[PDB]
Design a binder for this molecule. Structure first.
Ligand SMILES: [Zn+2]
Length: 259
């Protein structure tokens, strides 16, 4: 089946061998150059209504750790911004690096953070997460950068569950958790259209990148890259890094919601 990873043989540069989309015009991530970004005053603020009761499970597919929500009906919503309507929250996951100096996927003015958080939502108008993947506005992603600093007690809630899913395939119950408690003070954002940063890299993403990072400690970052990519019974391979290099911007325009 689909065979990819982040190693030198199944890494980012070889993905296009098994997945064609990896060569489209609208791939992510990209690098943000504020000098080229104008403030679009037509952009409205965004808002969420998360039902912490919609959290179901936490799993380690060996590529990253996810947190799945019940998106079979309107429970945890995201609305506003450049969104044609409200979207359902499906899940979140992290990309990180080997050290605190790098790790994010998007970079601003040449600056890379320690990690990047992705909250994936989809448009109910398209009936079906699978069917939404076929539309340029099927998915909506909140992107949160992570910088090192004081320890985040909110984010810590989530980390205490990692133990239960150390290896690939693991999966455990994870309920009553509202990811909005991680959002930073400011809600100002960049926005552009792109794709998934993992195969099959569908170009169905409207991106909402926050200008302000959430802060976390190194102890917490360390915990994150202590997860294993190998299966429960296999030579333990640490999950060191799962970020994709920045792709070509092409003719895309990245709009700002702030001045
Ligand atoms: Zn992602």
């Amino acid at each position: 089946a689909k065979e990819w990873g982040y190693a030198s043989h199944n890494g980012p540069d070889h993905w296009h061998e098994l997945f064609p989309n990896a060569k489209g015009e609208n791939q992510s991530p990209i690098e943000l150059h504020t000098k080229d970004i104008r403030h679009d005053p037509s952009l409205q603020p965004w808002s969420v209504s998360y039902d912490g009761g919609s959290a179901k499970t936490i799993l380690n597919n060996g590529k990253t750790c996810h947190v799945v929500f019940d998106d079979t009906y309107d429970r945890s919503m995201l609305r506003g911004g450049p969104l044609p309507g409200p979207y359902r929250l499906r899940q979140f996951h992290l990309h990180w690096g080997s050290s605190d100096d790098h790790g994010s996927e998007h970079t601003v003015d040449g600056v890379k953070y320690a990690a990047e958080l992705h909250l994936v939502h989809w448009n109910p108008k398209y009936n079906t997460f699978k069917e939404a993947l076929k539309q340029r506005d099927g998915i909506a992603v909140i992107g949160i950068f992570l910088k090192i600093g004081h320890e985040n007690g909110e984010f810590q809630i989530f980390l205490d569950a990692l133990d239960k899913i150390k290896t690939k395939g693991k999966e455990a119950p994870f309920t009553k958790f509202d990811p909005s408690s991680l959002f930073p003070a400011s809600r100002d954002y960049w926005t552009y259209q792109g794709s998934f940063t993992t195969p099959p890299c569908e170009e169905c993403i409207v991106w909402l990148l926050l200008k302000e990072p959430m802060t976390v400690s190194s102890d917490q970052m360390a915990k994150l890259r202590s997860l294993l990519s190998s299966a429960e019974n296999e030579p333990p391979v640490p999950l060191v890094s799962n970020w994709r290099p920045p792709q070509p911007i092409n003719n895309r325009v990245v709009r700002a919601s702030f001045k």
